[PDB]
């Protein structure tokens, strides 16, 4: 093997690739076959493995004369023989073969193969000795019959165990061999796009939320987002009875995703489907420092919440790329501006600007990325450091007095959230270990979150063979004592509710309030008949809106959801809704 612009020779054993570290440093090479890809790297043992982990085991007998299979540049591969000596490291003893070749012969097999020749020492007093360096062989393989009905299967898949590149397509292939109506649920479209790319060749049809239902006899596999799946349950009785449902990033706390989990779990109990929930942080784990692919350096130190003057030199002294999680879009703007003042160029990410800015994070070369919670789910980066104050905003339904949804925060995140923000690094093997810089500790209790109630609002509005009642997922149904089906809407109100969420871009709670009030979708009078304290402020001034009629009235909704004026875009959409435009 040679690269010119041979510095090292590799070995392909057990389907995987095994070579030295300093010869490649992690660069991908393409043969006539498919392009390679790194997987594992230990700098301490100077070893690297492509397309899979280390796959050959120890066998130095400390007495048996081993030999090196040399491969030199310019000529044929030669063969030698040696009685190795002892290399006495303080921690342990490793074999040492005294040998020498021209530079670029590292990765030569030893004698099966027991070591990788390359890394060595040069005593000025004597000659140059080499070390029989090899790591301990170590996994994930083909999955079993988890396709049997009435069986939910949780996969604790950590980034990056080949969840998208290896496992998911293998599951899909087996599902197609068994002729199954397979459903694939991705958290976001960008993830779904990464799937349809990973599922290349396989018959996969991406579904649009513009289509209520789509059916074909030449049976394919349906790939769609969580929200798409939920809305189709709310907009069509023509919902297919899938026998295998695979939800990726099932830890998602978005109301649509939670409702989907409840419905899927219900369809499993019925014994008409088998489920597969893939997530690094299952609903029964609290470890914010999970074991990752590449070693992670966990650093606790205080982190700027606003613009800073001096002191935090450690932030900017870092030369690699950096990911930073902020609680809100405004706080993120403050941080980003203070960062750009220092020369660094920052890409900003949010929930409703993600599809516009995330592709830049791949194409554009950037120094920083400031993000809300949206990157916890299936958002991959090529950075090396995560700055995580572990602060976030949480929607809460206050029942004290008139019911309203506020945005409590910046409140500390959940253990799963912290694990995911941390999980954004520690998968790409670099020479320097990835740094998870954090501050403070997460809070377990999040059962005052509005999304659980919104999830049940969505769940018990789904038409179901009755029969039974669509209840929440097991490990999550204890996070709300809302009685099953107490949010049931009948006929016209149900259609209004779905339309308010889909065509109105309004949160589930607010939509439920307006819909269950018997208000028609086009009626916008409720946006102005609220309490004086329900007056909405835009940059410290009271909002005044020119209606569909042509009338000017102060924006004062009858029900107040903080998620409609938390962000300039959100308010802009909501003001477009109040003016009867959409």
């Amino acid at each position: 093997r040679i690269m010119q612009r041979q510095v090292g020779v590799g070995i392909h054993m057990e389907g995987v690739f095994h070579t030295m570290w300093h010869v490649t440093r992690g660069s991908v090479i393409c043969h006539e076959t498919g392009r390679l890809e790194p997987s594992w790297a230990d700098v301490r043992n100077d070893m690297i493995s492509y397309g899979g982990g280390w796959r050959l085991g120890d066998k130095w007998d400390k007495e048996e004369d081993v030999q090196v299979l040399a491969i030199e540049p310019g000529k044929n591969p030669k063969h030698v023989q040696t009685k190795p000596g002892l290399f006495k490291t303080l921690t342990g003893e490793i074999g040492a073969v005294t040998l020498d070749f021209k530079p670029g012969t590292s990765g030569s097999p030893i004698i099966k193969v027991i070591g990788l020749y390359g890394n060595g020492v040069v005593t000025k007093s004597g000659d140059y000795v080499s070390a029989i360096t090899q790591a301990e062989r170590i996994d994930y393989e083909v999955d079993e019959d988890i396709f049997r009905k009435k069986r939910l299967t949780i996969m604790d898949l950590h980034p990056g165990a080949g969840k998208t590149k290896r496992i998911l397509p293998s599951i899909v292939r087996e599902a197609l061999k068994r002729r199954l109506r397979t459903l694939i649920l991705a958290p976001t479209r960008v993830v779904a796009a990464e799937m349809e790319e990973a599922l290349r060749g396989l018959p996969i049809r991406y579904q649009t939320p513009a289509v209520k239902s789509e059916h074909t006899g030449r049976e394919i596999v349906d790939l769609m987002c969580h929200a798409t799946f939920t809305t189709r349950l709310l907009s069509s009785t023509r919902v297919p009875n899938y026998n295998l449902i695979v939800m990726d990033e099932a830890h998602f706390t978005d109301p649509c995703s939670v409702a989907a989990r409840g419905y899927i779990s219900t369809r499993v109990e019925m014994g008409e489907a088998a489920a597969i929930f893939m997530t690094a942080t299952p609903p029964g784990s609290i470890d914010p420092f999970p074991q990752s692919n590449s070693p992670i350096e966990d650093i606790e130190r205080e982190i700027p919440e606003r613009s800073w003057n001096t002191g935090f030199d450690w932030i900017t002294d870092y030369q690699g790329k950096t990911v930073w999680f902020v609680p809100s879009i405004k706080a993120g703007n403050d941080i980003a501006n203070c960062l750009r003042k220092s020369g660094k160029k920052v890409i900003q990410l949010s929930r409703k600007t993600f599809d516009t800015e995330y592709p830049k994070t791949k194409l554009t070369d950037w120094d920083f990325v400031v993000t809300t919670d949206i990157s916890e789910m299936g958002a991959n980066f090529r950075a090396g450091r995560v700055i995580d104050p572990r602060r976030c905003l949480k929607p809460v339904i206050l029942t004290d007095g008139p019911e309203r949804v506020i945005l409590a925060g910046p409140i500390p995140v959940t253990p799963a959230s912290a694990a995911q923000r941390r999980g954004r690094i520690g998968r790409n093997p670099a020479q320097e270990d990835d740094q998870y810089v954090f501050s403070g500790d997460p809070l377990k209790n999040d059962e005052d979150h509005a999304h659980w109630t919104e999830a049940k609002m969505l769940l018990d509005n789904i038409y179901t063979p009755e029969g039974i009642i669509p209840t929440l997922f097991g490990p999550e149904r204890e996070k709300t004592q809302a009685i099953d089906g107490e949010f049931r809407l009948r006929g016209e109100q149900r259609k209004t509710f779905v339309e308010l969420m889909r065509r109105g871009d309004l949160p589930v709670w607010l939509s439920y309030k307006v819909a269950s009030a018997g208000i028609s979708y086009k009626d916008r009078e409720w946006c102005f008949t609220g309490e004086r304290n329900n007056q909405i402020l835009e940059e410290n001034m009271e909002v005044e809106i020119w209606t569909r009629e042509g009338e000017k009235k102060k924006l004062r909704p009858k029900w107040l959801d903080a998620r409609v004026y938390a962000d300039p875009m959100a308010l802009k959409d909501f003001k477009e809704f109040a003016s009867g435009r959409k």
């Binding site: 093997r1 043969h31 301490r44 043992n45 030999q67 491969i71 023989q81 190795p84 000596g85 020492v121």
Partner: protein, 36 residues
């Protein structure tokens, strides 16, 4: 990367050279090696 042109075989015809010096080394985080 070119073809390895490699086989996992044993040639007994291979030359038997080399010394066996007992060597004492401390490891580096970088992968290099130390003295004494």
């Amino acid at each position: 990367s070119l073809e390895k042109a490699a086989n996992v075989q044993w040639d007994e015809m291979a030359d038997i050279t080399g010394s066996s010096p007992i060597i004492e080394v401390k490891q580096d985080e970088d992968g290099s090696f130390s003295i004494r």
